[PDB]
Amino acid sequence: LFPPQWICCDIRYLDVSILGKFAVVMADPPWDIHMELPYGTLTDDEMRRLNIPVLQDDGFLFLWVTGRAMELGRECLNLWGYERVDEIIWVKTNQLQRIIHWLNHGKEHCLVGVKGNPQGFNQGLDCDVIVAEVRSTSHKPDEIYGMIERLSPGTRKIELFGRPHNVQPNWITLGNQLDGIHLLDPDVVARFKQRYPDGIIS
Amino acid sequence: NDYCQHFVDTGHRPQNFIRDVELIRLKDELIAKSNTPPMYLQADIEAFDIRELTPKFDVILLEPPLEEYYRKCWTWDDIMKLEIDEIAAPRSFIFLWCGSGEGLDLGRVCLRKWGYRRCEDICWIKTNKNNPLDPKAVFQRTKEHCLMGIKGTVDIDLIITEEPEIGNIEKPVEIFHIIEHFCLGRRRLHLFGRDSTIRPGWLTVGPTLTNSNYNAETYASYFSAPNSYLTGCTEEIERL
Numbered sequence: 001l002f003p004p005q006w007i008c009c010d011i012r013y014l015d016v017s018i019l020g021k022f023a024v025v026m027a028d029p030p031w032d033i034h035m036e037l038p039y040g041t042l043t044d045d046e047m048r049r050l051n052i053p054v055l056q057d058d059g060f061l062f063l064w065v066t067g068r069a070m071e072l073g074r075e076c077l078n079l080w081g082y083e084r085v086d087e088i089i090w091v092k093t094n095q096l097q098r099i100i101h102w103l104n105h106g107k108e109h110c111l112v113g114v115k116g117n118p119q120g121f122n123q124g125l126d127c128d129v130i131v132a133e134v135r136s137t138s139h140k141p142d143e144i145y146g147m148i149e150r151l152s153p154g155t156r157k158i159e160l161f162g163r164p165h166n167v168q169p170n171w172i173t174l175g176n177q178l179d180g181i182h183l184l185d186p187d188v189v190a191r192f193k194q195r196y197p198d199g200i201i202s
Numbered sequence: 203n204d205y206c207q208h209f210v211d212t213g214h215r216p217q218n219f220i221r222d223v224e225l226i227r228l229k230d231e232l233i234a235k236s237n238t239p240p241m242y243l244q245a246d247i248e249a250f251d252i253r254e255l256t257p258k259f260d261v262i263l264l265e266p267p268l269e270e271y272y273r274k275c276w277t278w279d280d281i282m283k284l285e286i287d288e289i290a291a292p293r294s295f296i297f298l299w300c301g302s303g304e305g306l307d308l309g310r311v312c313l314r315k316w317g318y319r320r321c322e323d324i325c326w327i328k329t330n331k332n333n334p335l336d337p338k339a340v341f342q343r344t345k346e347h348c349l350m351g352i353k354g355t356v357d358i359d360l361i362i363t364e365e366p367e368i369g370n371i372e373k374p375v376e377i378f379h380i381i382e383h384f385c386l387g388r389r390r391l392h393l394f395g396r397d398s399t400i401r402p403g404w405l406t407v408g409p410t411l412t413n414s415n416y417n418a419e420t421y422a423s424y425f426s427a428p429n430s431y432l433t434g435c436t437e438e439i440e441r442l
């Protein structure tokens with residue numbers, strides 16, 4: 001069911017097996033980098049224990065990383081059964097196309113992992129650099145969804161740790177700052193009602 | 203404006219539309235004064251005992267000829283068997299050119315294998331304003347990564363230049379400016395440099411060098427007291 005769908009939940013406890021299989025997985029996880037943090041974070045073990053492996057048979061993972069999560073993200077990516085085959089760089093500009101410990105950071109990284117053998121994807125249409133303006137804090141650019149749609153048009157996709165602005169057609173967004181549960185795909189709706197007759201994750 | 207869409211339409215890479223490419227020039231001048239004379243040595247590094255390279259270095263810049271630069275090549279197998287930890291100073295830094303493929307993973311193993319942790323990921327973004335694939339590639343690769351590692355206790359992490367002509371494997375000389383502006387020490391080693399990369403303040407060692415002038419004793423003499431701990435960014439120490 002093409003229109004946006006989402007599930008407010010704690011992704012640690014949600015039984016993601018009810019959601020089926022996706023051509024693309026994207027995540028912008030709340031990595032525990034050594035800081036106070038304006039939001040809540042996931043420990044390295046919770047990140048490792050996420051049940052990503054059930055979400056795909058053949059397809060691509062997009063995984064935002066920063067700081068020491070450039071290494072931890074690679075660990076998670078490999079533990080979950082993916083091979084890192086590409087790495088997208090978003091160059092952060094202002095409205096005038098100028099770029100915003102040892103060096104100042106003009107960019108954020110997005111690891112691209114493959115699992116299985118995806119077939120019928122349009123590999124090579126886009127290039128691995130995004131130039132796009134910063135929006136709110138920890139707000140990734142919209143251009144990633146068009147890149148992902150040209151790569152795998154019309155397939156089901158799932159985003160983890162998304163926020164309300166992340167909800168898109170063809171995507172199921174999970175996150176704990178979404179508003180409630182909006183589900184339209186009848187297969188998903190059925191399995192959700194079965195797993196959660198009273199509509200609560202614990 | 204969606205520059206990803208635009209590249210799909212026109213072939214102009216999104217980085218083609220980045221603009222803007224007191225004074226840090228006194229700093230460049232202090233760097234230039236404290237620079238040791240250029241020293242260089244032809245060495246076939248596979249067959250070489252790098253322990254002969256002394257003293258131990260404050261900075262190592264490592265630029266192995268990857269097969270992927272050509273479309274003797276060094277595989278990551280060969281690279282991670284280099285005994286870099288035997289010539290690095292207990293507190294020191296490495297800058298490792300990793301390419302854009304498996305090098306982004308195997309280069310991190312190398313850094314860890316030699317005792318470093320990565321503190322920066324410097325990206326060389328290549329524009330194609332003048333001319334608008336690996337089987338596993340999902341996207342067109344338009345950049346290379348130079349990983350920065352540290353061991354022991356003004357600039358941005360992006361270099362933007364036009365894609366060099368096919369067959370040209372040189373890396374942007376801007377990498378030297380970034381390194382030297384960090385003021386990390388004066389023993390600087392460039393492994394797999396060339397005649398065209400030789401540069402004041404650096405020891406260059408590579409197989410294609412046509413001449414050598416390296417002498418370990420002469421080289422160590424540049425850092426004997428009172429100069430042992432200079433950062434490379436300060437005034438020289440006065441003599442007689």
Ligand SMILES: Nc1ncnc2c1ncn2[C@@H]1O[C@H](CNCCNc2ncnc3c2ncn3[C@@H]2O[C@@H](CO)[C@@H](O)[C@H]2O)[C@@H](O)[C@H]1O
Nearest residue numbers: 009010011012028029030038039040137138161175176177
């Ligand atoms: N067990 C879990 N299960 C499911 N989702 C989880 C989760 N544990 C964390 N999440 C959710 O994963 C998302 C992680 N996204 C990474 C991007 N980073 C930011 N995310 C959100 N707000 C931010 C961010 N950076 C600055 N802010 C500012 O602070 C806020 C409050 O002050 C707000 O006002 C912003 O403006 C996030 O939604 C988490 O809640």
Ligand SMILES: [Mg+2]
Nearest residue numbers: 285286287288
């Ligand atoms: Mg050894």
